[PDB]
Amino acid sequence: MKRTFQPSVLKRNRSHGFRARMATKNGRQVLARRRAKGRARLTVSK
Amino acid sequence: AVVKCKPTSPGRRHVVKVVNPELHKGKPFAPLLEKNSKSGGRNNNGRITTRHIGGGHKQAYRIVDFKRNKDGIPAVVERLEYDPNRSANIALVLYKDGERRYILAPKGLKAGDQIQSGVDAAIKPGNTLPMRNIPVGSTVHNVEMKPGKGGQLARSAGTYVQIVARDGAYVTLRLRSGEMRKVEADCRATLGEVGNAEHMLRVLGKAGAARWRGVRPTVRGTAMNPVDHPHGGGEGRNFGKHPVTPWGVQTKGKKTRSNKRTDKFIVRRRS
RNA sequence: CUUUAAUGUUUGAUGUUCUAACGUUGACCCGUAAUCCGGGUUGCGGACAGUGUCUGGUGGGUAGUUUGACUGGGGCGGUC
RNA sequence: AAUUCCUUGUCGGGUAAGUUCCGACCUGCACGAAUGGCGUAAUGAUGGCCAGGCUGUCUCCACCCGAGACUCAGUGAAAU
RNA sequence: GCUCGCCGGAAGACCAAGGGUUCCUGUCCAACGUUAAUCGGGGCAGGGUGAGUCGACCCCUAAGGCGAGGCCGAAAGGCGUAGUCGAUGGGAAACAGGUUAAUAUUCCUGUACUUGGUGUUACUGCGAAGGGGGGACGGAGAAGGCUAUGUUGGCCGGGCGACGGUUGUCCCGGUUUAAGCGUGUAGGCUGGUUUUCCAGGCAAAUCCGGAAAAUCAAGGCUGAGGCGUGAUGACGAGGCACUACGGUGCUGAAGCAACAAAUGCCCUGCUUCCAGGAAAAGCCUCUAAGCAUCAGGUAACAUCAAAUCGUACCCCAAACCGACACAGGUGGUCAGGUAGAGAAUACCAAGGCGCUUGAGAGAACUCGGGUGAAGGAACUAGGCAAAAUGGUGCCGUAACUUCGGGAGAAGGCACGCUGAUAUGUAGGUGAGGUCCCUCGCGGAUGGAGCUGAAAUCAGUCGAAGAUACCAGCUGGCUGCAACUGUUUAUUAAAAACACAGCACUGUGCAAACACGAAAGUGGACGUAUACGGUGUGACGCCUGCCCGGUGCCGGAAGGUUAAU
RNA sequence: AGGACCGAACCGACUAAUGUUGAAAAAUUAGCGGAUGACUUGUGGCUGGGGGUGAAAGGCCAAUCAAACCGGGAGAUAGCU
RNA sequence: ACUAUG
RNA sequence: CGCGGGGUGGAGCAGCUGGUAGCUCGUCGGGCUCAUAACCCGAAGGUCGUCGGUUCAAAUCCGGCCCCCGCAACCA
């Protein structure tokens, strides 16, 4: 069967990457929330 | 001429196509083409605002001249072309100063025909001139509404506004709907009917032929579930509503013109 | 008092004109290398249209809810 | 009758025998004209019925070829 | 190592994506590996990825994104102009041979090409953010020309056979060579050249567009392949020798012709059809502002430059997505032989595998296959399943029909091998030689050689000649839906949805309607022969009565009635 | 010529058997339907939860759908176990 | 205002 | 059965709120016509299904019995 994850680095990084988050208000709140949690990976980048 | 194609497959059985031998075969005139990319009925929010549109064949936009604003200078019809954006065929014209433009092809107009705009022009089909300078009685097309804006009324295939009255600044038009209507009389109108009037006699003959013109399927309310449409549910085939749009407004009867600023210009609503 | 008249009078609302608010998804000019926007010139509408506050009508388009108990199981019937 | 409760209605056809099928009748419990009526060549992994061919489907199972089953060696689960 | 078996339009080779050291060498076997393991995609150490031309980067744009000013919005924000991003598309250039344990169009050997910079010399109207050209575009179909490629002959080098025959019309192996540069062919497109005038291309234009005369008909553009050169080279079956028996060294034969032939190239061609088939830059050309001894432009020669990042390995998979070393999923490219219509199927080549538990036994029962006396649907809810039918050519073919269909209806017949017609025909191809010529990649006749159906007649073997694999069961009545389609990913494929067609109704354009507190966008760069909604559902014959009820439409006299 | 016919790739999913702590959280074997189109497929893009999209099955929206998932109100409330 | 049948 | 409705001159209907039985057709008698039908005139006829209660009094209010319709008889 074809399964749901069909990986593609361009699409990963445009959905979820660092500059994607730093666009919207809401995505900056996300980065703050995980800096605050203390989180080794912020985002999905390299 | 209309042509009952012979029934060799079940989808050819009912097709009736509108062959015109007089049209151009070969690529259309290049300077007047644009890109024109499709919407699938969706707006700047991505949402379908208009159901049933989608797909079909790619199409270039022919820049037609609806204004006809180039005056006193005679023009010869080079050829009649197919135009996919449009029920009417169009005509390439060459002016006496070597400009080309497309225009709508009126009924009875072939290669070699002189056609002229502005106020001097003779009252013969093809020719555009302000409606003060046309005889009452006359049959026109591609009619403006504000002076200088360009033709809006009577552009489809086989259509014609018909001038019924002068009265000062304004004139009165029996539009094709059956709606008498004042337009102020500096507004231009080409003369004639519009061509290709056999266009209504065509029959597409199969589903796919509708898809080629960019027209998706249409699902009846009574098929759907109650959450999707007012016509909703039923065990079996019920109705028992009064017919309504998907957004719950009565169809079959209910009038929907509220537009008070344009009311003064309407002599009489359609029959 | 009844009926009625012109003297004057305060508001009325029913037309018809007008232009100066307002409209213009008419045309041209400029910012400008720009089908946005703004400004100008000129037409066409014109106190209408349209927006606010108040108000009647409509309104399963949407929402929140209700839709009793007894009962030789429940429902129907019957009762309170 | 994708509609008929009574109903395996009655009559005819087909079978040695037909609650199904086909043709009729009309007593339509409770068909019916674009929530369409009656017809229809072609089309259908569509529903029902009949016939020829073919057969281990069956009378009624028999034998054979491989893979597991069983024994030996090594590894080694699970529901409860 | 020697046999055996399996894949071979893949179970082979090569890209992209995705992974990221899994690659190669040494070493170790605790754990991992559904068993052991000296082996490993496991542990440890070391090694390996070499570019002006391949790809990204870069120049250009699509859908789309972001968006200075701007418009709109309690706030957050929303939409959008100028712009600026965004490939899956457009834009310069490389081939052959060699070599490592592991890279190679990247290294080495040869032979090339591309675009920039600076300098010299000769000649000279250069120059946009503007004008024009070009780039620049669909589907189907046909058939002519080729090549990749293959088969056969000839040429060269080996062999003369473990068992009867095998010095011959016998056997085995080889017969390969690129980009580039030169020539310009089958074919395809097109009248050509010079002058004069002109409300068009936002201004100017010598460019494009337009109108006019005058003059020769053959000039131009495009273009596969072939031949020439590249190549006196490279490769090359082997042979002559040294070897840690892994390989290292030295030399090197022939290297032609014919036929068949693509789904590849001419071909972005040609013919045809309606549903009428991106954009922008590079590129070519025109001028305006500007500058004229300059600057810049054109050609020739020199000289310098072409950075950076990717480059290992897996890729129909043990390395990707599925928790697994998982019978699943995954875009593109290549396409040998014999049979065959074929990319089906069988057997094979190149190449690659034997699927990481085995060894015996030969019970019941289960799984997957084979055969079956007599009968032949009696089975069963139901012929479910199985059996059967199956090819090519020829004969022949009913009701009904929308005249197309039904129809491959049904149902028959022939089919192997050998020979003759003809030591191989009809046909296809076409050399040598003669003849001609605006003398070449030319034309005429000419037919050697090569290839080669189909038929008839005569013979001959078998139980059976479409012998295997492959490959329709057929007919009759009837319901529903006209038809091809669509549907419940994971128990429903249907009579459900859709459909062409029909009808009603709304909508006069700042349209109705829809998404949005709004700006705005779709509708539509459409305009009533158009667009939205609702119902019915090809076609044929038709479509009756009711306006009391409920909606909708119109009507305004009177009644009742809100804020004020 | 054709939403024409037969039939590989490719798309699908009608019947049966197996499997049902599977080889597989939907497959395998044998047959089956489409196969120049209302076809199929790659890369990128748009539509967002009472919202989308829907040839309409309440289908699909990351193995979840008559209202997704993650966090919060939150120790919701539970005359019931 | 009249009308049907034998 | 559970619920509800209806039995009225010969036929179809009205009257059901206790003191009063009507409407159209049919029957009977008279006319008109040669005769019949139509047409004109005049007259009758109803135990109000049946039994029993209540009231001074019952078609009428109330109960039982009989016939006749309609609706319901469901979830497993």
UniProtKB/Swiss-Prot annotation, chain A:
Q: What keywords are assigned to this protein?
A: Ribonucleoprotein, Ribosomal protein
The residues forming the signal peptide are none
For this protein, what is any one GO molecular function term?
A: structural constituent of ribosome
Tell me the GO BP annotations in alphabetical order.
cytoplasmic translation
GO CC annotation terms, alphabetical: cytoplasm; cytosolic large ribosomal subunit
**UniProt xrefs under Pfam families:** Ribosomal_L34
Q: Which InterPro entries match?
A: Ribosomal_bL34, Ribosomal_bL34_CS
Provide the assembly information.
Part of the 50S ribosomal subunit.
* Entries under HAMAP family matching the protein: Ribosomal_bL34
What family does the entry list? Belongs to the bacterial ribosomal protein bL34 family.
**What protein name does the entry list?**
Large ribosomal subunit protein bL34
**Species of origin:** Escherichia coli (strain K12)
Curated annotation (Swiss-Prot), chain B:
Recorded hits in HAMAP family, A to Z, give: Ribosomal_uL2_B
Q: Which PROSITE patterns match?
A: RIBOSOMAL_L2
What name does the UniProt record give this protein? Large ribosomal subunit protein uL2
- NCBIfam families, alphabetized: rplB_bact
What's the stated role of this polypeptide?
One of the primary rRNA binding proteins. Located near the base of the L1 stalk, it is probably also mobile. Required for association of the 30S and 50S subunits to form the 70S ribosome, for tRNA binding and peptide bond formation. It has been suggested to have peptidyltransferase activity; this is highly controversial. In the E.coli 70S ribosome in the initiation state it has been modeled to make several contacts with the 16S rRNA (forming bridge B7b, PubMed:12809609); these contacts are broken in the model with bound EF-G.
As for family, the record states: Belongs to the universal ribosomal protein uL2 family.
Report the InterPro entries cross-referenced here. Answer: NA-bd_OB-fold, Rib_uL2_dom2, Ribosomal_uL2, Ribosomal_uL2_bac/org-type, Ribosomal_uL2_C, Ribosomal_uL2_CS, Ribosomal_uL2_dom3, Ribosomal_uL2_RNA-bd_dom
Provide the alphabetized UniProt keywords: Acetylation, Ribonucleoprotein, Ribosomal protein, RNA-binding, rRNA-binding
Q: Which molecular function term from Gene Ontology is one that the record holds?
A: structural constituent of ribosome
Annotated region (Disordered) at 27-52, 220-271
Gene name, Swiss-Prot/TrEMBL? rplB
Source organism per entry reads Escherichia coli (strain K12)
Cite a single Pfam family from the UniProt record. Ribosomal_L2_C
GO BP terms: namely: cytoplasmic translation; negative regulation of DNA-templated DNA replication initiation; ribosomal large subunit assembly
PTM sites of type N6-acetyllysine: K241
Q: Indicate, by first and last residue, each region the UniProt record lists as having compositional bias (Low complexity).
A: 38-47
